[PDB]
C-alpha cells in the first residue's frame, strides 16, 4: 500500500474542498441577493410615467424607496440568507474570529462595511452601501406630492437615473468579482484532484 500518499491526497483535497465550500456559499447568498434586487428593477418601468407632454416625468419614489428599504432590511439581518462567511447552519448564529473575517473580507475583496460583529465573534455580510446610497439619493430628489409620487423634469430625472445605475453597476461588479473568484476556487479543486488521481 501507499498509506502516506493517500494521507497526503486526502489532506490536500480537504483544503481545496474546504476553500471551495465557503465560495459556494458566498456565490449562492449573493446571486440570490441580487435576484431580489432584480425583482425590484423589473417593477422599475411600472413606477415611471411621463409628465404630461414629455417635458417632465412622474416617478413613484415611494413604492421604489419602500421596496429598496425592504430589501436592505431583509439583508441587514444575520442568517443563512444574509451571511457570506462563515456558512450559517441551523440554530443560533455561527461566528468567526475578527482575523478570520478580515481575511475573507480581503479575499472576497469587499469593504469594511461588510464586516459585522455578533456577540463573541464576527461575520461577513453582503455590501448594502449601494442600496443605501440609492435610497439616500431618492430622498435627495425632494418630497413627493400628495399622491406620494414625484413629478420632475427630464434634466433632473436622467441625472438621478445616471447615479442610480452607477450604484446598480457597483453591485453588478461585486457579483462578478465573486463569481470569477468562485470559478477559480472551483477550477482549483478540480485540478488538485486530477493531479492527485494521476
The three-class DSSP label of residue 101 is: helix
What are the cell numbers at 145?
406630492
| Boundaries of every domain in the chain | 1-198
* Residue 115, CA distances (Å) to 27, 65, 174, 197 in order: 17, 25, 15, 39
Which is nearest to 174 in space by CA: 98, 111, 88?
111
CB 146 within 8 A of CB 62: no
- The Cα–Cα gap between 105 and 154 comes to 40
CATH superfamily for 1-198 is IpaD-like (1.20.1710.10)
Backbone angles phi, psi at 128, to 5 degrees: -100, -5
Which set of grid coordinates corresponds to residue 182?
A: 468562485
Name the experimental technique. Answer: X-ray
> What is the number of other CB atoms lying within 10 angstroms of the CB of residue 85?
27
Angle between helices 154-197 and 3-43 (to 10 degrees): 160
Amino acid at each position: 500500500m501507499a498509506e502516506i500518499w493517500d494521507m497526503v491526497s486526502q489532506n490536500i483535497s480537504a483544503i481545496g474542498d474546504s476553500y471551495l465550500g465557503v465560495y459556494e456559499n458566498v456565490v449562492a447568498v449573493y446571486t440570490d441577493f441580487y435576484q431580489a434586487f432584480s425583482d425590484i428593477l423589473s417593477k422599475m418601468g411600472g413606477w415611471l410615467l411621463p409628465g404630461k407632454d414629455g417635458n417632465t416625468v412622474k416617478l413613484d419614489v415611494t413604492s421604489l424607496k419602500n421596496d429598496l428599504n425592504s430589501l436592505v432590511n431583509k439583508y441587514n439581518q444575520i442568517n443563512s440568507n444574509t451571511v457570506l462567511f462563515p456558512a450559517q447552519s441551523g440554530s443560533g448564529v455561527k461566528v468567526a474570529t475578527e482575523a478570520e473575517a478580515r481575511q475573507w473580507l480581503s479575499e472576497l475583496n469587499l469593504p469594511n462595511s461588510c464586516l459585522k460583529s455578533y456577540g463573541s465573534g464576527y461575520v461577513v455580510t453582503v455590501d448594502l452601501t449601494p442600496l443605501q446610497k440609492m435610497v439616500q439619493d431618492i430622498d435627495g430628489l425632494g418630497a413627493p406630492g400628495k399622491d406620494s409620487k414625484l413629478e420632475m423634469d427630464n434634466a433632473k430625472y436622467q441625472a438621478w437615473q445616471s447615479g442610480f445605475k452607477a450604484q446598480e453597476e457597483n453591485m453588478k461588479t461585486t457579483l462578478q468579482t465573486l463569481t470569477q473568484k468562485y470559478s477559480n476556487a472551483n477550477s482549483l479543486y478540480d485540478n488538485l484532484v486530477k493531479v492527485l488521481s494521476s
